[PDB]
Every structure is written in structure tokens, then in C-alpha cells.
Write a protein of this length. Structure first.
Lengths: 212, 212, 212, 206, 212, 210, 212, 211, 207
């Protein structure tokens, strides 16, 4: 499973890229809105200068015509820009139009397999099921990844799954075992993944033995 | 799984096509008869003008020779016309005869795997098992999809499954997971598939954060 | 699984009772509201005169103190009145208070196992998971029945499960297999459960052979 | 699984009873066409003896059932799976009369019948098999429902066509299987039983 | 799974062929002997005139040398003649000799997987396990199909399985699901496979709705 | 699973009984013929073994089988009458059961036969593992089927796994729920053996002895 | 599964108790240390005045003899006091000593099944496996619940499992399904368990229909 | 699963008992041999401290002599359990001792056939050897699963002692698979108490408590 | 599953190689405790991967050490500990075409990070996990499933092998390689029925 970082903070992105592990970035309106005094499109230019993989940027309008125009504009920023579109009927129309223009798309706010399959059949490059948000209301988000992977595999769809709303390390292992192509997560989750107490003990012992 | 719309209403078909999601259409004698003031063959011309994928049109006669002549007539309307034939002995004769002339066929009113295998071995391009009608008399329609998929896979048949008599969103996910190539459904079902309360809530939150 | 009828219509209730199959009744504010010229309390009197089993009547206030007073008033009507309480924090308060007074409760609008368990632990006599409403937003309602039955069995809870939002005959067979104690359904579903085409054919053949 | 015999032919019933295996009998309007007979049968057989009503109207079914019940304690009234049938089953049950609901082809019907008070339910294996639905799977469903819910309703596997139905019905938990006498005799046979008897006798005789 | 008809009756064979479903024919000495006043070799000539697929014709001698001569004689009748050999030691010798000549063989009277594998390893084009005859002596005939499929798949054998002694529709679906390449059955079974009460009802409702 | 010894040899039976492991004995016409009077042999055996001792009738006619079984039953109270799986055998079993005489229905090769025998009143049914194995049908699976049937339906009928050829039949019969396994003495002795047992005895002894 | 609240905050505990769902309380040294200006023992008196169920209070010393003395003192405060003992060798000695004196114990900081079994065999009333902390270092905490339940059931142990380090709603349903006797969780998690968007929507619709 | 300690060492047995966890003791001829004290005197000391089953092994391989040795051992204390090797003479000794009301533990068991024979001779315990099977490429834990299934299905009250326990993984698996008892060295018992998050948890608790 | 010998003892390595079975060698700083001369000797004898561990914990220094190690022979594989700096080093070394083996891996999250940094090999520790009550063999199963599903060419080295049961299970679960002491390798050859069979064959053959 590939690692994307789920943030609009440029320093966090640089740190993740420097780890040697970074395949992509996801931003959303809330993540962008929490960053102080910088232009959205200028920020995207900075991110795409650093990260060569997919960089998701979300449209603001809810109207298909306006989403399509926003998407064409976003796509001009850099070749690796992916246009994030919400799961709505108008969103499906925008995904189809953008796909016809050769512009990559990522349909977000996906909470079930029916939504994922619609998005895939509209032409989506990526679909983004939300794990944590489902978990919190008593439905297993990880089970959605399994469903979507089984559907895409059986039917020969090239659509790629981004596991989103990742809260903790248990989501990461399970998303990978269940076949999510990509997991997008906060920087703090990425750092948690490096750690184990026996790694800490092993390093100390190796070095103690080495140094007389 | 591909989305077909199960209707003869032209307005509904145009709406479905505008979603960017439509791979085909199925009509049947009941669906056609409920529409007012237009010729069956003229309606088919309008539909095939809009939809590039398979469009099913059902024969009226129960006699093989008449079914074949009806099918040859229907095939002249457009290249994407698929001839719907009922699962009977005469039907199997019609399917073989039409297949010998290069005409695509969809065998309908299938309720078990023996019927589906017969239709496939007669040359059927598609088979249409009925989910809801089976569910209502206490047999699991979705289990039929599983049986036919396994038979076609093991034996190397290129026959395509159209899950028909789709009544609700739970039929759609399950049919896709079980390997139905196509699902044909009312427009109302298609619109239902786009919706989830957390999608609504997510849009609202993204927009509130974006706007100061 | 026991059969409850999910209606406030007295004629429907009398008909279901006359089948010889009826173990109880569920009403709710929507079902009561659609019924014409009769008092809620008068209607409950008539229903409890006909049906000896549990009869659910729902409170209207969302404040615990007021719910408790409504529940006390409802309980005076007949010994088989069960007080229906919506799944909220105030609802749990009301369930505990009413349980302490010896009054039976039915916690409604349950959509996950976390809610079902909280309700069970507040003292609920019944819990009512909603099958159809879950199915429609792409989560399997029947799987919730399985979760709740497993929890109640493993932990020795006497809480009873009412499978609600039953839409069709496939919900009935599955809820029964999965261990719902009770299924509440519209009268029309109950009638559909009696029917099978080989029953019709068997009756006709037995009579043809018997009559010369 | 108990063995019932599915016939109205008295010679076959006596023959089956003589094997030491017979736990009851089922008749039906088709088997009959080809009250005194019921008296004869219930003198020979101690277990449940099913006799089917003729009317399709609840009130008339109930009267017929009351009359049938006077013949012997082990008379079981066979009622078809209809709405009127359910009414009849409840009335008869309230009078302490045993019932067997027939023409059952799914688990919804079996459950309704059980909840109306039926002593027995009779799912039809072969008739389902022939239209492409697995009759044996219906046994599995009904057994699971009855066990989970603590129902004392008994399953009679009916429309048994062959020995494979018998083993599977038993494995899946049918309380009873009803079958023609022919099927019962076929169950006794195996080529290695024949060969083993011959070899035992050859060795024994020098 | 392919449909073969298991008969030596020429009218039945022509009727089966007319359905559009017929991939081949199996005769055997008992099926041939019940047909009146026509020679065995003349009957085979009539059958192979009608049916283009494999037509099985069984040898009478039990001695390998005589089987091989009978088989060379049968092979001259038509290119689609397949030589039926009983499962015996001398049978295996005959299968190997005929296979070396390029003549197709079908080993019959198979009741276990040891026999099926021996036949396959001698060169047999087809093996014919007998379902019904096993069922009657208390062994599951369908399980033998599962064993032979599993063995042939794992080991890369091109040997084909003909499910024989088919008695009813339940044998057909199960043999197909379990991987029998071919099922050979009586014509009466083939007709039964077309039938379902909801197909009948569906045809009636379509016509009712179509005719005002 | 209980151990029965499947032999008519009195010396073998005494040796099996001395091991501390013997719950019963099965004889049959072939085992008896290979060896003294039959009924005198049965007296000797039932003097040594307190558990069930199976003795097979010779006639194939039910009335005659019943008379033979009544005579056999007088020999000792632990005598069990072995009846072959035929239609007359079922008649014989029901009659003998009504008279309180224990029975063991033999030459069982499928679950339909075993269920018939059980419903006729059989104390024991004897499926034949090895003979089924050799014609390509898994004998052990028959044990699994009969155990499931008897368990689900509350039958007290006991299963004797017969035609046991080797140690592998023994472990599997026990895991699958045969109440009893009847086997030759040579099989019983093979069951005691393992190379790591031999090795462990040597090692325990060497360490104990300085 | 029973609900315990995992906090030393008296206001939070009172609020939880008011829901009608509270079966006990767990405190620990970190949880008590974060509460300002009240003594440990006075706080325990306040808690045990409100809560009738098990209230866990953790010893401070790591020496067995001192743990035993601290436990004896703690148990005098109220009959429902349960002495929390860390999983160490000295801890096991304290557990057995306290068990012999009829004092209830809860062995904490359990991270594997070997520790849980040792604790159980020393006489522990409760064991507390830590879900979240295991999850964070890449080991499935919920699988530990499954192992300990299996061991306790197979071997007839009356030891009770408290699922601890509960982070979110997905831990609660899974711990219940897997057989944890008790879950102890922060107040914020308990309130999240009450909520679902279809519960919200259902309340609105009921009231709309009820009010004309 | 109950904990037994697999040692003849008196100091180790006392330490184990002091943990509050000890349900019994197994000695064997190799374990006793590695200790300057009389064997029967040691058994008295052990059984004075430990109430549960204490296993002591016979030396002779001859049935008659095993029986005489067992009767002598049984007089030492009520909780003495006579350890007998899995052999034909062993089965004879188990049946004879069982008839006298004396407890037995059949040792050197490496398959389910041996375990069943021993159970049917009247054995109180059977001791399958995990580690020794593992080392020759056969899964010792699977033997526990087999023996437990057999005893459960057939209503046998025979108890399983998982022996040749080498490491903590044997302990959790033997317990999951239904071994009534596991016998192990004291070192293994102390290893079972340890986990790095337990260490870290303690440190954090005390850090927060002390300002 | 390929056999590697987990030792820095040159005598043990030559014996293992002489068995006909050896696909590689792992050293580590404990096992090792002139290093580079020994590595030259080992890589002359063994054609397959030979793992040598870096000493520094700082990324820049690990990279320089790795570049130096790589000059010794084509089959040198640089062993790097699972830390943030280690991931940086793995990516740099991978970009230079140098093979890497990430060690001290105890969960599937670590294994996946390592794979995505470019690691040639990842080394999960079986015995060390087993001892703290977590099933080391289940980690092999997880990593194999992740690598297969996602098309990763990363190879698994099952490390901290303690006994023959670890070997069979590691192979069944899909570990590409198992590294173990020579003692364990010789133990794998043995079975009492092999001993008995040889004796019986020879007795029959000699009259």
C-alpha cells in the first residue's frame, strides 16, 4: 500500500518527503483552511514542486458546470494535480467530464460500496472511503475497503482506492492487508508507524555488544 | 458491475445518461406498455440515439419462427439492439437461430441455474436472473447470481449476467460482490445509490471551514 | 421468531390477530399520525383489548423527566403496554427510571450494536434495530441482528430483539435465522409470507385427483 | 431420524411395520384416491398417522379435523399452507388436536405454520429440486430456526425420491422422513453387504 | 458444462439437436439394445450425420486385442466417433493403443477417483463417473465429480469429465458447479431443465400488460 | 473410544485382557472358522471378558436368527448377537430387542443402513472401514456421518468401527466419535510404540544409572 | 458487556451514573494525578458513595509486602473497592495474599495472554488487557480479548475481563462481540456511543408527522 | 490451564509456590538425578509444601516391580502421583494401580494412540511432549488439540499435562488448545510475567504520581 | 524458502556452504562482536546475499558506511535498523543501486515502511516476539499477504529462528528466506525413522 500524507502544511509535507516514503498528498477544504496566510493555488504550486506523485485539491462549488471549470483550472497548476470531487450526482457529472478531458479525479466522502462503484463507473481515477468517520457511528470502515477491493478485482476496474480518515496505526496494517492501493494519513500517524519497544531494546543491545 | 437502467421512459433514460454512468438499457413488455402515445419501434430509435451500449427489446410471440422474425426486425433498428427472449424451449431455438445470424440476445425470466446454463449453451449474449421475484417467494435471488457466476467462470463461458428485478440498494452491492457483470435497475434506485448522511455532513463541514 | 404487526390501524391488527399468528403490536408517531379521527389513548385501549401480547406506544417529548411522566401515564392503560423510547442520552435516563418502576420499555431508532448494548444496559425490555433504513444507505441491516444476538447470548442478557423496518420477505427469513426474537412488519408482508407457486399447484393437483 | 411411510396402501404399511422400523404414516389425497381405513391403520401403527382435510375453508377444515380426531389418539390432521389453514391450525391446537402443515416450500411458510401451533411441518424436497431450488437446504434452514428459537415443532421431510435424500435429511436434522416402502427396502442394500454374507457363509461351511 | 444426450433413440437425438443445445451423444450397449430393428453401425452413421460433436460407441469384447480391433472399426464410421471402453485392466491396454493411433476414447463404469485417474493416465479423452448408481448405494456421486475435477486441475490433465447416470435436475446444477466438463442425460431431464413456475407467471403478466 | 479385540482366538483375547485396556470382543463366522465348539469358545471368552462379546448368527431367515440369538443369549449375560444388515436382520433385531437381548448389526457400508439398524433397536452398529477404503470410498467419513446423525437425533446406539487395518484408522475413528474400535491384537500392540518413547527410556535410564 | 467509566473526575462519574448505564469505575495513578486539590482516599469515598459497583484503586509500591498493606487499607474504604495491582512477580504475590483475605483484585498493565493466565491463577477477580496501547505498536488488542475469553471459557475460570485502553467506538462493539465482561472507557466515548445520523433523522421525521 | 513446575529442586518449588500460582510438581528420573538428598525424603519435603499433584517416576520397566514401587510411593503422601512410561508393562501397572485407588501419570507420550491407550488403562494424567516432537518436525501442539478432542467427545476425565515446554509460545498455545495443565521450568514461569509495555506503563504511572 | 546462515564465524559459514544448501549469510553487530577483511573472505566463498550492519544511527553516516561496504563485493547487502534515519538511508542507498536489509522489525507497519523506502529485504524477528507473548509466525503471514496483494518485490528474511518448528512454519507462511545458526541447519536433517530405515536397508543388503 502506498503512503500519502493528509495535510496542507508545507513543512509536514517536506518532512514526510524527506523520510523516503512519500507517494502523494491529499488536501481538503478544512486542511487548507487551517493554514494561515498563504494562497490556495500558490500552496499547491509549492507542494507539487516538492512531491512528484498525486496531489489532491478539492473543488468548492456544488454545481457540476462550476466544478468542471474549477477542475480545469486546478489541472493547469501542475501535471500531478488530481481534482477532488465530492460524492454527489453533480460530482458524478463533473468526474465524467474531467475524465473525457484527461484530467485525474479523486471522489471523496465515500461511505459505502454503492457510492464507490458509481464513482468508479463515472471514470474516477481514485475513490476515498472514510475509515474513522464510519467507525465512530458504529459501522466498520475497514469492511468497506474489503468490499471495494473485491468489486474492483472481480470486475477488472483500474480505479485505485485511497483509505482516508486514518486515525491510528491499526487502520494502516488492516487497510494494507485488505487491499487499499493507498493510505492517506496525518504526519503523526506516519511517525508512530516507525516505533516498537523491541526495536528500541535491540538497538541498545547491538550497540552495547559492539562497544566492548 | 455496469449500470443499466430498467425503463422505457425516455426522460428517465436521458437523466441516467447525463450522470455519466450509463452502460445500457433494458425494456420489457410491461415497462413499454405503461408509457403513453408513441410507437415501440420509434421509442427504441430515440433510446439507441441516446445510449451507445446494449438496449434490450423483448419479442412478443411464443413461437420460435415468429420470435426469430421479430428479432431480425428489431436488429434493423440499430446496431446496439439486443433481442430479449423468454426462457422457454422455443426461446432456446430462437436464441440459437439469432446467434447464427450474429444478432445479440438476452434471455429473460430466469429463476434458476439450470435455465441460465441452457440459455448460455444456446448462444445467449446475456442472461437475466430475477432477484426480487425470487426473494418474494422465499428463495434467495442473490444466491442465484453466485451460482451462475461460478458456472460461467469454471467453464470459460463469455455469457454476461444481468442482475434484474433489482428493488433496492442492498441488491446492488451484493450483486456486484457476487460477480453480476451488469445490474439493471429503476432510475429511483440509481439516485438512492448516491446518498449517505455522512456525505451530507462532510460537505457542510468542508464549506463552513472554508468560509471563515 | 415471533410475529408482531407494525401498524396503528385497528382493522389491520384485528385481521393479523385472526390469522392465529400474532404475538404483539408496534405503533410509532408516524404510524399513529396517518390514522383518521381517533384519540391515541383510545386507540391503545382498543388495541390492548384485542391483543394480549406486547403493545408498543412511543413518547413524544425529548426530555427525560417528561418522557418518564408520559411512560407512567401510558402504563396505566393496560398491563401489556410497552413504552417506546428513542435512542438518546435522555432516553437512557428514561429507560432506567421506568425499569425501576416495573414498566416495560422498547428502545427504538437503533442503527448499530453500540446503541443496542447501551439500551440493554439501561434496562430495556426490547431493542428495535431498523433493517430497511440501514440497507438503503448501504449498510447491511441484517448483520446488525447477528451482532446484537451474539452480544446478548455471550453476555447472558435477557433483552429481546425486535427486527424493525422490515420491507420484504427476505428480511423475515434472515432475521429469523440470525436470531431476532421478534419481527415486526406491515400486514402486507405477513400475507406475502403465506404464498408459493408450488403450494398453489399442489392444492390444484390434490383436488383434481380427489374429484374423479 | 424417524421413518414414516408415505402411502395409503394397507399392505405396504403392514410390510413396513413388520421391519420393526415404522414410527408413523402419512397419507394424502393423491395417495388415497388410488375413515374405516384410518381405523385399520391406527390399530396397527402406534405413532402419528396423518389424514388430510378436503375443504379449503377454515371453518370446514376445523369441523373435519374434529371428526378425524375422534377416530384415534394418534390421528394427525394434515392442513395445507394457506391463510385459512393457519386459522384451522390455531383452532385445532387450542382443542388439543395434532396438526401437520403440508405443501411447504420455504422457511417463511414453515415459521408461520409453527407459530400457528403446528405439531409438524412438511417441506417438499423433490418438488423443489425439480424447479432448481435445493430442497435439502430448506431442511437446514427450518432446523436452524426451530433450534435457535426453542420451538418444539417437528420437521417431516416429504417428497423423498431416493436414498440420497434420506441420508442428507437425517444429517441436516429432519426429525422425521416420510417415504414410499420401495425406498425403505432400497436403504437396506449394499454390494459389500452381499459379498460379506457370502464370504462369511463360505468360510463357516468348511 | 456441455449438454450431451444419453440415448440411442434417433428421434430423441434429433429433437435435442433442434433445441440448439446439443454438444454430443452417449450410447452404451443397454441403450442401443432397447431400440428396435436397425443395425448398430447404421444407427451410428445416422447419429453422426445429425450430431457434429462427440458420439460415444461402446466395445463388446473384454479382451484388449479385440477391443482395439473393434475401436479401429468404429473410428472408420465418422471422425467424431469416440470409443467407449469399460474400466478394466484390459480396457486400459485398449485405451493406450487407441490413443497411440490418435483415436478418441471414453472410459465408462467409473465409481471412484482411483479408476478415473488410471483411465486418464492411460490416455483417455473422457472419463464417465456414474452419479445415480453411486447415490443409490449410499455414496455421494456428486462428491466423485469434485474429487476428479480437483485431481485433473492440480495435475494439468486435459482429460474431460462426463457426468453420467444423471437422474434429475439437482444432478445437473451440482455437476456444473463442481466442474464436470459435460453432463450426459436423458431427453426428459433436458426438458425439465427449461421449466419454472415464475417463468410461466412472468410470461402471462407480460402478455396481459401488452394486450391492453 | 473403547478398545475391543476382533478375534476368536482365546490366547489373543487373554493377552489383550491382561493389558488392562479391553472393553469387549467381536467374533464373526470367518474368525471363528479359522480356529473346539463354538458355544464352548463363547463360554471361555465370557468367563475372561466382562464386557460385550459379539457372536454371529448363521441363518439368513429372521425366525431362525431369532431362535439362534435366544440360545446365544443364555450362554452369558454379556453376549451380544451379531446380525447381518438385511431386511430379515432388521426383523430379527426388533424381536431380540423386545426380548431384552443386545444386538450388533454388521456389514454396514453406508449411513442409510446404519440409521435403519438403529431404528430397529440395535445396541451397536458396525461400519467397515478397510473394506470401504479398498473400493475407493472413505470409511472414516462414514463414522463422521453416523456420529452426527446419532448425536443430532438423541440415539443411544453405539458405533463399533470395524475392518480396522492399521494405527491411522484408530486415531481417526476416535477423533470422529466411534464409541468403540474393534481391531486385531497386532494393531493394539503397534499402538503402544513410538521411537521417541524408546529413546526417552534409554535416556532416563542412563541418567539415573550414574 | 458492562460499562465502567475510566476516569478520576467526580463530575464525569456523576454524569455517567445519571445515564443509568454505569456498572463501575476504574482509576489509575495518571488519572488521579491529573485531578487538582482533593486527596486520593477522600476521592474514593466520594466515588463509592455514588457508585455501587466495582471501583478500582491502584497501589503505588512495587514491593509485595507494601502492596498488600496498601490494598488492605484501600479495601476498608468501602466493600466495593477493588485493588489494582500491576502485572509483576511481586504483583502476583500481592494478588494471592489479598485473595486469601477476601479482597477483590484487578491486575493491570496486561499485554498478552500468558500474563492474563498467570494473573487469573494467582486469584485475580479482574484482569485488564490494554487495547489502544497494543494497537499503537502494531499488535491487535482485540485479538488479546479473544484469546483470554477462550482460555477462561475452556478452563472454567470465573475471572472477569475488563477491556481497557479503549480509544473509540470500534473498540467497544468488538470487545463486546469477543466476550469482554466489562469495558472501561472515557466519558467522551460513552456519549459518542449514543449517536447516529439516522437516529437524528428519525426523530425529526416522527415529530414532523406528529405535529400536522 | 494450571501451572506445574517441572523440577526436583526444592528451592525452585518453594519460590514457585510463593508466587501464588503453583498447582503441582513434576519430577522425573533425569530431573531427580541432577540434584545429595534421598529421593523419598525429597518427596516428603515437596508434599509438605505442595497440596496438588506431585509426580514421582518408577525405575523398573517390569510391570510387577512398577506396581510395587508405586504402592511404596503412594504411602508417602495423598497427592503423590506415580509416573509410568508408555509401554505394555506400563499399561498393566496403570490398571493395577488404578484398581488400588492410586494416581498415575503416563509419560513419554508422542501420539494420540498412546494417549488413548493410557486413558483407557485408567491413567489420571497423560503427558504429551511438545518440544521433543517439534524438534523432529512434528507439531507437538497439534497433539494437544487431538488429545483434548478425543477426551471431550468421549467423556474421559483423564487430564492432559503439556510437557517438554520450551518457551512462552508453548504456554499460550497449550492453554488455547485445552491442556488442563502445563508443567515447565521456573525460568519459563518468570519469563511469562514480562512485557515492555508493562515496564513502560509502570514508569509512566509513577512519573505522573510523583509531581 | 532459501537457507541463510546467521553467523560471523567463518568456519561455520564454510561448513554450511559445503552442505550444498547455502543461499546467503547474515551478520549483525552482536554476531560480529578486521570486519571488512572477513566480509571479503565470506563473499569469496558465498555467491548469494551477505548482510553487513552499519554502526551509526545517523542517516548521513549510515549512507557513507553503506557506500564503503558496497565496494567490497557485488553481493554485499547493507543491514539498516528500523528507524526514521534508517528509512532515509535505505532510500539513498536504493537510489545508488545498493542492496539493503532492514532489521529489528516487529510489526507489519514497520515492514511496509521499509518496503516503501526501497528495502531489498526486511527481517522480522520470530523468537523475540514469541517471548513477549506475540506470535512471530503471524507477522510472516501478514507481511507475505501485504507483499503479494500489492505487487512488492521486497523479500522476507525470517530472523530470530530458535528451533525447527520456526523453519517449517516460516516456509509454509511464505518467508522467502530463513536465516539460522548452523546448529539448527544440522538438526533439520534428523529423524528417528531415517536412522531406522538406513539400518534396515543395510541389514537386508548384507545377507
Amino acid at each position: 500500500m502506498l503512503f500519502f500524507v493528509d495535510t496542507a502544511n508545507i513543512d509536514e509535507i517536506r518532512e514526510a518527503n524527506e523520510l523516503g516514503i512519500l507517494a502523494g498528498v491529499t488536501t481538503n477544504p478544512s486542511l487548507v483552511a487551517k493554514e494561515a496566510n498563504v494562497s490556495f493555488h500558490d500552496r499547491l504550486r509549492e507542494i507539487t514542486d516538492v512531491v512528484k506523485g498525486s496531489v489532491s485539491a478539492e473543488v468548492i462549488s456544488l454545481k457540476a458546470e462550476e466544478m468542471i471549470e474549477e477542475g480545469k483550472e486546478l489541472a493547469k497548476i501542475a501535471p500531478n494535480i488530481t481534482v477532488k470531487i465530492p460524492m454527489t450526482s453533480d460530482g458524478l457529472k463533473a468526474v465524467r467530464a474531467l475524465t473525457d478531458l484527461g484530467i485525474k479525479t479523486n471522489v471523496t466522502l465515500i461511505f459505502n460500496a454503492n457510492q464507490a462503484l458509481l464513482a468508479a463507473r463515472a471514470g474516477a481515477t481514485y475513490v476515498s472511503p472514510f475509515l474513522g468517520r464510519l467507525d465512530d457511528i458504529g459501522h466498520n470502515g475497514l469492511d468497506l475497503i474489503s468490499e471495494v477491493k473485491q468489486i474492483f478485482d472481480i470486475h477488472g476496474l483500474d480505479t485505485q482506492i485511497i483509505a482516508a480518515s486514518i486515525r491510528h496505526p491499526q487502520h494502516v496494517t488492516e487497510a494494507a492487508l485488505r487491499g487499499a492501493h493507498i493510505g492517506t494519513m496525518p504526519l503523526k500517524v506516519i511517525h508512530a508507524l516507525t516505533k516498537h519497544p523491541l526495536t528500541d531494546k535491540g538497538i541498545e543491545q547491538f550497540l552495547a555488544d559492539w562497544n566492548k
